[PDB]
Symmetry: D2
Subunit: 291 residues, 4 copies
């Protein structure tokens, strides 16, 4: 039931780098409009790690007002701190989110046992909302084994795994081991490949501007049409190429600004703005996607 | 015409740890009858790096005698030394191989130009034979960029790329850049996903014992039956889970042995033998693969 | 005036995980009486990334009170966010600290320019307090180059470099490039070698329980007594070996708790408690350090 | 008694890239006159991995012939193949080298037991020659654990360890574990620091052009003159800075060439030439060094 193509919501800031509630609302609605199955809020893409708990809760509350009941809402609640995560877990519950999620805590190296108790404590605080384990070795620096992953994924309370890893051998072993597990493909660039390996949906930042393509790839693969599946994927991939040159969060916000969704396409410092030289390609991209 | 499913051939040894030429011939034929498209000989799978050039030249000659004309023959000629490689390249030509191949020279760190000059030399000595750049970062320790991969791939005389990387975002990037390039999926564990990403064939050590499944996966994806393609990949992956436990080269040789192909399922030390506990499952798999 | 042997201050918490101010003050004074050159507060050792800005502000404020120009005071003000770092940098000035510090922002990959601007803005908000650029690749996952380090270290406002790296070739080269740079060695396990290589002092978590050994290695080398320099370092290493087994922060708090300095030997979750099995060794260690 | 500053021997090649015996002998004696405690022949610095068994043996005999009895002689006998290594170990005995040495077999991933048995076999063939374990993770791609290094170092036959690692905490840990172990500091850029951490000697390539400095640092440290000890290490690093910039093996041979020691300062391909922009720098270096 949590399966599908969920977008990792971006958080629009204003000239003062404060939250832009109006753009947030425009963004939520814009995603709904584009036929997304749900939203993963306050994740890395939402720049959670560069905002406070209150700022973080404020976003959860607003998207819940906008989207609750219309699509699935998963609140990324993870912090390095379990206590901070627990507080966020409770708010998500209070706001009516469908599930809660958390990255494997970072910076300080924690044992695998400490990782499990973290999830256990957060799940406790979720008070019912299922947990989506969030695995992104590349950013967390947390390199869990398949076994550790199997343990986490079986922790009572866990309803999904957000696999932000390009190891498609592992993607399938996870599927082979947990046939019923809601498996989200974390890297947009290999979405079609991830689904073929075992993912049954996905969460990602590029879904904010072209979510329909991912839905497309999903149908095609269902309708045994690898031609449109591959075609759709290379089209997502050309966009990802550019965003990787420009900065994905900022580049996605910039395109969004061009679709009239976001007022100021800035990210919080230390992120810098997009290089002016990249604006013609982003503008152009916004235009084509607008059609 | 180099596109297809090519077994990365194993080299049988006797109790004295010396080529079991009689089993080599038996392995060559076995592969042919299982409908393989060609053989990548003298690679990592063939324990080439624990061999002498003369040993490698001998294996080259026996398989050419065994299959020149029956299937495509690609000779892995790579050595850390350019001159040794050129020697091996020159015999491949003289023995009648269809193409030549070489790992990026390892152990010592080399600049990219050195890498390109290395391939140029080998390509020259191959005397007309198309070259197959061999990319396996996990074993070579060489971490080439995409631009570098494009440069190598476009070097005159080069006719294909053997991609032993599970980075399927890079697989498609390469493909998007080179629609005519013969791209071999190097990781058996992700074959279906690798093809979907842009690969048009594969070279793998597990093909030796169940190459038919990989061809089947090719038919399925070709026929829009991703459902049986997945099924084929998981079956291939259950095998891979086991071989990775028992040790791959030796595991395969043991299976082939129970299949009456290899007399002595040994690998040359440092490799040790399979743990006896594994024998029943390998024996079981052998009988089972006889499907 | 920032050169020296300075302890990476730990932050004591109570049974309910709240700050234990009395033990903070108690730990500040203990370090002072231990004859350390100053304190590095709010850094990795201080469990800053498991606290909130106002929590870190409180700690800075309490120790500034305690360390009233009694010793050198460095405030690790770094966060991923430049703005949060600026706020902390401004409080540090406000509390009267001697220097300001910050790790290279983590989690999200940033460009070198993004990093240089980050340090400037903070240097900007410190309003006069020098900046000790903080380099710890192992934790930040940020891999700066010598030239990137050079740029940072020459950046106006920057007055020191906290080298938490085992690469002593790079340590040598940085000293070579900057003969007067306050270079602090970050890995206590190699303190003697980092010094020989060019580090002119150090900042470490284990200084909390044996800051004198580190001060000793310094004298030992100053007087060419490399023989005792070695003995001190292996004595430090025998300790670090145990601390790594148990978990460094918690192990330290545990020793310090057995020395009646820290009331509760806990670290905030997700850090769990120390395995009972190690208590016999930690009690003994606390015994002998006190014996010394 | 293998304790000491041992120079890692370069193998001079001719214009045709063939062993330049004239220069080998010339270098053996040059090193001797430098007051070096011995020579580590046939190692990484000796381009062993780009040579053949026969060529490696040849160089072994010529050097035994040139310095056997005069200085300590450790022959690097290591290859990926245990059998090849054994053969070279057997020859070292024959030529009368003092010790044997082998890098952890690389390229293919081997188990620690496989690693152990390999050293055992080679130990068996060195016929009485104590084995020197060569740890160089950077190039080998092998990251043994301390307990693992401890096992290796205590193997019956192992007499020393060449630690090519900049982990000076592990250095002191090895010295603490084995107070009577012959521990060679492998990275010349940290010589002084390695010795202070526990190494009682060192095997380095740069020793070939200024072995006196390392012997110099040793005395200063032994005398308690860290100030000059340092002043010495900084000098070696100014050099090392350059060589890295120019390519170490090729840079060294060039400097020795300007020191009328080596005829053709060529490394074997895939390595390339020293760029011309450096010749003046290297020129200037060789002059200063000779005075």
């Amino acid at each position: 039931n949590l399966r599908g193509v969920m977008a990792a919501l971006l958080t629009p800031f204003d000239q003062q780098q404060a939250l832009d509630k109006a753009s947030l609302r425009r963004l939520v609605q814009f995603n709904i409009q584009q036929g997304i199955d749900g939203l993963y809020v306050g994740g890395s893409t939402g720049e959670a790690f560069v905002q406070s708990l209150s700022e973080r809760e404020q976003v959860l509350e607003i998207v819940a007002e906008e989207g609750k009941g219309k699509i699935k809402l998963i609140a990324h609640v993870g912090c390095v701190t379990t206590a901070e995560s627990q507080q966020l877990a409770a708010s998500a519950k209070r706001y009516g989110f469908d599930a809660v999620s958390a990255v494997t805590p970072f910076y300080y190296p924690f044992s695998f046992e400490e990782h499990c108790d973290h999830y256990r404590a957060i799940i406790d605080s979720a008070d019912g909302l299922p947990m989506v384990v969030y695995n992104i070795p590349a950013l967390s620096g947390v390199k869990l084994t398949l076994d550790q992953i199997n343990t986490l994924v079986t922790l009572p309370g866990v309803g999904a795994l957000k696999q932000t890893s390009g190891d498609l051998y592992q993607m399938e072993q996870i599927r082979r081991e947990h046939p019923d597990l809601v498996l989200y493909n974390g890297y947009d660039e290999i979405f079609a490949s991830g689904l073929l390996a075992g993912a049954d949906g996905g969460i990602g930042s590029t879904y904010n501007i072209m979510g329909w393509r991912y839905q497309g790839i999903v149908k095609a693969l269902k309708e045994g049409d690898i031609q449109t599946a591959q075609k759709l994927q290379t089209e997502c991939n050309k966009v990802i190429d550019l965003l990787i040159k420009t900065g994905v969060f900022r580049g996605l916000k910039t395109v969004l600004h061009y679709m009239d969704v976001v007022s100021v396409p800035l990210c919080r410092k230390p992120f810098g703005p997009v290089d002016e030289k990249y604006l013609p390609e982003l503008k152009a991209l916004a235009q084509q996607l607008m059609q």
